Symmetry: C3
Subunit: 404 residues, 3 copies
């Protein structure tokens, strides 16, 4: 029952300790409090009545912003995003390119505006400040952790960019983990537009901040000593829109290519598998069979672990966007396999993160531009940081499944 979840949390903590750079340097206050905050934050908004109301209140607000932003894409694509599309194409009336991708543009513009006004910096300063005073983590790495709740892995360190070239290896590693453990506000609304429950996305986003620090300080404890704009609001919106556009195009091209490549792989796997009496062999089977124990460990029922392993595995070997794309049909009435509500929650939390191998190259570019003489350290800690970010997503999923 609930005992399998507590065992799951222990295993996840255990792996991090085994992969630590110095187990004797692990600050018990830091990693103890970081786990405590993530666990309590989960208990607050998923179990406690008042916390559930604040979560649904924030989520409904987010859901309202999405609809407002949809006026923009509705103007540009007209009837191609109207209700008439379902009367004609049925299920195929939902055009992903026009329904989901433009959201990345609107939310990038919005966040850019919220930065210009000082609203973003205000919230980050409060959250990031509360983390460092409770965990003993440094100022810069804590602000980046809090920033990662709302923005992406390359945008979050910008709030502390003059402190990045000289921050310690542990600090830099945590900054990397802050981004890998979390997502961004832009794609959050994208996944939400695909059918993923906003409550789960918002929750996993907030739990990423203490979770990211937790496994960063477990696997890479501090062994050193740390230290310590657009002309107007309309320009801010324009710059944000431009950034979101480029990003919308990149995601769209990636999805066309990756899904296409997966279709090619399955074709080959059918022929190769046929040589061993398994012509039905696909990539989903391999990933599901290999990640089933991992899915079972985080609280997924035995009879649903294999299907859950398909999505979690695909998120790891590729990215979370491709995973969500294959998981979204399981959230509709036309789902091939009806999953339990708890299993739907666990997958949503376990997928909610940028933790993948390809994110290392992205970290090298974005974070590396802030500190060009530190690209060596980033590439060195890349794989470990992905593992740490992965463990944070898995932990958040285990916690979510515990109180559900």
């Amino acid at each position: 029952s609930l005992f399998m979840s507590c065992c799951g949390m222990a295993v996840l903590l255990g792996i991090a300790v085994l992969l630590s750079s110095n187990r004797k340097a692990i600050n018990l206050r830091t990693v103890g409090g970081a786990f405590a905050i993530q666990f309590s934050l989960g208990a607050f908004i998923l179990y406690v009545p008042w916390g559930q109301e604040l979560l649904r209140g924030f989520s409904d607000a987010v859901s309202n912003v999405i609809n407002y932003g949809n006026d923009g894409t509705s103007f540009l694509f007209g009837g191609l995003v109207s209700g008439k599309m379902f009367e004609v194409f049925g299920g195929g009336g939902f055009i992903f390119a026009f329904r989901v991708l433009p959201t990345l543009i609107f939310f990038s513009a919005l966040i850019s505006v919220l930065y210009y006004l000082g609203v973003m910096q205000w919230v980050i300063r409060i959250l990031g400040g509360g983390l460092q005073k409770a965990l003993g983590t440094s100022r810069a790495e804590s602000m980046s952790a809090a920033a990662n709740i709302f923005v992406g892995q390359t945008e979050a360190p910008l709030v502390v960019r003059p402190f990045v070239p000289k921050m310690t290896q542990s600090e830099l590693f945590a900054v990397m983990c802050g981004g890998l453990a979390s997502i961004a506000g832009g794609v959050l609304a994208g996944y939400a537009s695909m059918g993923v429950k906003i409550e789960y996305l918002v929750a996993a986003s907030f739990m990423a901040a203490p979770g990211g620090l937790l496994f960063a300080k477990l696997m890479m404890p501090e062994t050193e000593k740390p230290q310590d704009k657009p002309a107007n609001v309309i320009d801010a919106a324009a710059g944000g829109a431009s950034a979101g556009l480029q990003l919308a195009l990149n995601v769209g091209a990636m999805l066309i290519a990756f899904i296409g490549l997966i279709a090619l792989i399955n074709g080959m796997l059918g022929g190769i598998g046929g040589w061993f009496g398994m012509p039905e062999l696909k990539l989903e089977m391999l990933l599901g069979w290999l990640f089933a124990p991992l899915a079972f460990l985080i609280g997924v029922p035995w009879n649903e672990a294999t299907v859950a392993g398909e999505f979690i595995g695909l998120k790891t070997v590729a990215n979370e966007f491709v995973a969500y794309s294959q998981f979204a049909p399981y959230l509709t009435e036309a789902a091939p396999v009806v999953l339990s509500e708890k299993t739907k929650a666990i997958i949503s939390f376990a997928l909610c993160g940028f933790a993948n191998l390809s994110s290392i190259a992205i970290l090298l570019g974005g974070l590396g531009s802030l500190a060009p003489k530190r690209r060596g350290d980033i590439a060195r800690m890349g794989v470990k940081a992905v593992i740490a970010g992965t463990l944070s997503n898995l932990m958040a999923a285990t916690i979510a499944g515990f109180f559900l």
Copy 2:
């Protein structure tokens, strides 16, 4: 009657003089002739029979080029831009992304071709030469003024780029005003494709050249002493297409974001306004209520000034493309408020310009790349240049409403 229009012209001239850097340095020949040309050009093509025939003749030619260019977008998007779209989606069958945006690509390619052949330089040399011999303005600032009739604010100074780093503050300010007072050939066909009368767009484009110089020399008189390629036509077209593409993507992303942001603002304004007994409070109401006296001053009837203020205000606080998008439904039979034909003309002329605050950042990049040591002067004169460009659009609207 016609007395309210002449008062409007006087007020617009008055504001420019009050905001001048030196009223005693204002050359009466320059500003007298510049206003005379703009006023006579208006009288010519909007009142005089022969001038109206030349205007409708040029406009029909422009309208033919658009249809020719539409063969390109029809090939690429097929039935999504056919008549069948209206039989299925009705009004929503008009997909803006495929109907309007591709025009920016075709016209950018065309203008690039017309530059390679020397056709553009020929027309500019004639118009720009006639301006300097009549106004006493310098060679470079006059050519840029004439160039701005056909191309954008960043492309126009390219015909005089080696003279830009060393031109006087008054010259540079005029070059800035030449672009802010005008639009570009690419978007002209875009606005035309949205329902805006081509005759008004062509007229306002030509009246921008003397109008831009007029308020540039009023607000910033000359107190100093002025001075004085693709391998083939197919490469020219390719480069122009590429530029138009990037530009089409930028405009599309901006519209999705800005319209989305406006929808968010209205949602908030409804809640905030509700605290003061005005739950129906929107951005259009604020802009309309605040720009109604300005609209009434340029010749809009009292009972139509508020609606006209919504579009003029939106053009100023954002850009003219967003304004035209909200004004285009008022040019159809399904218009929420039936406006007089004169009011439709005034709004079309008052909106026809790149005069907005966001254009300053664009001027800093484009025009600043031609003279990097002059970016300081550009940012300093930015706001004044926007005002000057705004006054030129308003003046052109007042004149247009006078002869109508």
Copy 3:
């Protein structure tokens, strides 16, 4: 009969010799074997039973990869690329922007993956090695020739980039000719998706390698003495997708502009032609009338030479993508003029190449970045290289028509 084809081959060889930089320096082994290989390769896969089976076997494999890749674009555009589009828009249900362009993204990602795994380098090393041992051509120019069978003119020299800045003028010219005579794997599937027979595209791609070297060494014999990576496979796919995206956007913008410009030209040509009693005068008539002898020379029947000249001419004065776009309707049942199966083959082979004037500027950028001090030589040999690449396509067409 077959005598007209052999005369065609002789004329094509004759022109190259007349335009040679040194006829006395022409290596008879090189140009004799190069023609022999291209002729035998044609005889192998178009006439010989076993060769026809290997061709249809490879083509069916390519056709399977395309369908697999189409799962990506089907996910993104949903019902807009489904069969329902034909029930509603009929022929206009085929949306080029969503049917053809995304293929460029998937195949760029795939090729990028096949490079990371070492599969591409393996095949190139075998083919490129066989060429140099049989023709006596240098190592680097032979590998680039073999690489050009699968990738584009700017990507092919990358397999020998450290040898490019110091290769001889003849070597550099051959590298240029290798790209102009061939296409790329990405657009191959694009043209295939437009109705062009894959068998012809694959054949012309392979015949481009010896054909490119043939006319390179004829027109520019060697008079000097020659000499002699992404972190993971998922990053490779991502980078390839990104490159294909940018390329898909460029092609799309080019087609909108060029087709639009052609529509404008025809409008003007109708008015100009009307002055000489030819109001029906169009660009297709001019190109067809001017390229008819050339089409007749390569094996096109007298009563089909004019129509064939329209496409071949358009490919030369613009690019092969615009040509294929106007030729694709002639491959359907709704063709305005029913052409013989041999004529359809000849046009497909004669169009299958990047040989156009605009490709010189592309060569200056791509190939020039590998050797910035050699951009002078590239621009100097540009036109000659286009002619050489043109002759290779024409030769491949003559050969194809011979065995058909």
